[PDB]
Write a protein that binds this DNA or RNA. Structure first.
Lengths: 101, 65, 90, 58
RNA sequence: UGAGUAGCGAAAGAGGGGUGAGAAUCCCCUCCACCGAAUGCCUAAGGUUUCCUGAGGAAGGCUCGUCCGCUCAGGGUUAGUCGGGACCUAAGCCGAGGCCGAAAGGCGUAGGCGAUGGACAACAGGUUGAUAUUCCUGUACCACCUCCUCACCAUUUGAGCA
RNA sequence: GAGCUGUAAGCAAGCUUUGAUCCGGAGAUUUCCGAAUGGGGAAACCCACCACUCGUAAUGGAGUGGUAUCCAUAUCUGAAUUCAUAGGAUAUGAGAAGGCAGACCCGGGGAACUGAAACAUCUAAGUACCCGGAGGAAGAGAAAGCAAAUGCGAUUCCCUGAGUAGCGGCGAGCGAAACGGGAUCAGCCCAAACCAAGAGGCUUGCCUCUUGGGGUUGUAGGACACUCGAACGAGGUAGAUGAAGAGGUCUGGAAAGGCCCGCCAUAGGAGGUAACAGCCCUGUAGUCAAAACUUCGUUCGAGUGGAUCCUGAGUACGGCGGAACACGUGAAAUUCCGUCGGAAUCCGGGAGGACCAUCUCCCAAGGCUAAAUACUCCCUAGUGACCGAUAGUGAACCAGUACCGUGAGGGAAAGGUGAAAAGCACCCCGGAAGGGGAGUGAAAGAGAUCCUGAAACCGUGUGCC
């Protein structure tokens, strides 16, 4: 997908609209993307093996990649993505900007 | 890893290191059967290793042939 | 063929633990392996002397999970009776 | 039943009686048993009478 | 719908304890009863884990069921001498060559397959939850081999072998 | 070029920009059955011989490779009978077998029901089916033709001819061809005469067998004497690049929806994106890309003469008994089968639907031959006034399964939580199951056949009787 693990991204649709977040997950098997601070589900938790706790765990939940584009690192608005090569390895270059990633 | 089984000596040293890591693999199966082994990825990598080497030896001999 | 493959894994039961006291050992071996090459294999690789070898093979137990009705592996179990004052095994 | 020199073999036809009634029959060539040169070696192989009429070896 | 009806598939249990949430149906004990040229003990064909141990009781159990020939998790079958192979063959089958036949094919020699048959060397005690002429114990036996031993023969008017 | 060790929820662990997983091309291994091929056999097994290795004081044991039959060639031997053959022995063989797409094509063999309002001739039908064989197409093919004229010139296939001419218990029914128009378009090679050598028998060419001349021909021709295993472009298999709005606002749980505004377009195909998106993503149009295999396009001989000879023999054809030609023996040509008979040779033969004479056309008894053609187990990309889970394949789902049958065979039912498991922490009843609460969600009546939930059927309160 156009997004990668470890990217600063911006979300479009859903209840969470127009909020910043970082990426620490990726699911290319299902185009499924977990962003920080979005889809704030509250999972019911039983004790886990020898862990003696019982409660509701409030944690992240992943969203679809089609609702996420990354931002321009220069101007800061959400921008479209293009592909370009730079001295051997190809690089991810956002549209309407010359900067990479 | 991949290069070294070609870059080392032709046939000879491969045979005793073959039965060396076959001894090692045998030890992993023994200790897994008694339930003590930890690195379960070793039981995949040693048997892969063997195929790696076997194929190079076999190609080598057909290439010499 | 290669002696390091002819016996696959030992089996640890209460019966097995009983027999290691009186110096008979239990092993699961290859299906094609017969009474004698397991013996030559074991003194070749263990430095031990073994007097009598008994052999028996188990067919797979039928076993059910979910909705599938598969068959577990056919096994061949070997009993090796060491001689007197022979060395021990891990 | 075959013929070695010529392609004569038993063929299937239909005998028809009076009142035009049709039933299936067979047709046999006039094969004979006799001792013949096929290779340089003598053998006894079958031969049709029409083939023997054309003056072959014995 | 019948209708809460027919049926619940030959049979003597009863009582006290124990488990359990629940007990006519499970377990322990005491009497009674039944079979006993069998309903006893081995072992074919066949079945394929139903065997044992520990859990469980939704479905199977013509009721119940704490129970099992059900489920789940483990565990259990050891052979030179037993049965069959590397021994033989009958009936029959297959069949190089061949002999026949529109084709496929059919018949069949040598030969081979084929036990229900013939030959063929271990047995009586112990052992656990499951195996036992298989495991342990002592005494044996059969076939084959020689790093060895003693006795004898002749190494061509040749011992020995078949 | 970044998550990944499938389905599938695992933490005992571990691999990865020193470039993983993945995709494409070519390689290596590939146990044991299976034509199965060392011998046997009841598939998935057993028992061997030889050679070479491991191991043992040896025996036992282990590995590797060969070891089936038939056919072709070569060698040796070649009984009875030792002229000689059968046969036997050895070696060489990417040789054959068996399967397959239930399709398509040739052959061999080959029904009945049915129709005839019964039925035997006929029909069904040379259908189904069985056997053999190969092909990607097969068969057929260059005139002993079609035809009757200022004539056409290999086959094949499509329209037409035409339901015509015909055939037929002249019933039922069966049923053409040529002329014309189109697709396609390739024409060639032998045998014989004669010559040359070598091939021996000699009965001195009456025959060898291999080359070359010697050649394929009908208003005749030929002999016969005169005449000159590379590099390149385009595809295929992996792929890459690729324009344009989180535009504002409203409802909403979520905007792709409504209103008001912009942009791209060789791209408004399509799919996904919490609801109906060209501008969110994958993409799409164009534009590129191949290290390696693979498929297509450019290189590395005649005229004249005509003494003599040849022009396909148990062959054409005929009789008898059958078959196929639309044609059922009829006026029955023509093609083929079986038996018997059996010519002609260029002044020669064959056909022109009995047959005979004239006339016209043609040269059989020898072969090869692409394209137009038929068909989809497949693979690629698409399409549908095709189905939307009693439909559509039997099979949307672990289906040819479960199950039934001894076996051949027969042969089912069974799709849907949610956008995300966020799949019910915690409390109470209880042994559990199951419930009641609390919580998640937009929904809990949404909680594991879980979208919607009709009817039969079964309950509970009741207004009237």
């Amino acid at each position: 997908m156009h997004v990668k693990k470890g990217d600063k991204v911006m979300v479009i649709s859903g209840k969470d609209k127009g909020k910043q977040g970082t990426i620490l997950a990726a699911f290319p098997k299902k185009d499924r993307v977990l962003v920080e601070g979005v889809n704030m589900v509250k999972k019911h938790s039983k004790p886990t093996q020898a862990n003696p706790q019982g409660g509701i765990s409030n944690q992240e939940a992943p969203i679809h990649v089609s609702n996420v584009m990354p931002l321009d690192p220069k101007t800061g608005e959400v921008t479209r993505v293009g592909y370009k090569v730079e001295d051997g390895k190809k690089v991810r270059v956002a549209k309407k900007s010359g900067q990479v990633l | 890893m991949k290069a070294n089984e070609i870059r080392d000596l032709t046939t000879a040293e491969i045979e005793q290191k073959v039965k060396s890591l076959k001894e090692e693999l045998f030890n992993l199966r023994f200790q897994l059967a008694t339930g003590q082994l930890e690195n379960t990825a070793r039981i995949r990598e040693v048997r892969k290793a063997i195929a790696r080497m076997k194929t190079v030896i076999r190609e080598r001999e057909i290439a010499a042939n | 063929k290669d002696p390091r493959d002819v016996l696959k894994r030992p089996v640890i039961t209460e019966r097995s633990a009983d027999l290691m006291t009186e110096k008979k050992y239990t092993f699961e071996v290859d299906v094609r392996a017969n009474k004698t090459e397991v013996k030559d294999a074991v003194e070749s690789i263990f430095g031990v002397k073994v007097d009598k070898v008994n052999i028996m093979n188990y067919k797979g137990k039928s076993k059910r999970v979910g909705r599938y009705t598969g068959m577990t592996s056919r096994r061949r179990k070997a009993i090796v009776k060491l001689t007197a004052d022979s060395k021990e095994i891990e | 039943r075959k013929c070695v020199i010529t392609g004569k073999k038993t063929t299937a036809g239909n005998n028809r009686s009076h009142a035009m009634n049709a039933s299936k029959r067979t047709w046999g060539a006039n094969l004979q048993k006799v001792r013949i040169l096929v290779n340089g070696k003598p053998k006894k192989v079958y031969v049709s009478a029409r083939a023997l009429k054309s003056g072959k070896v014995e």
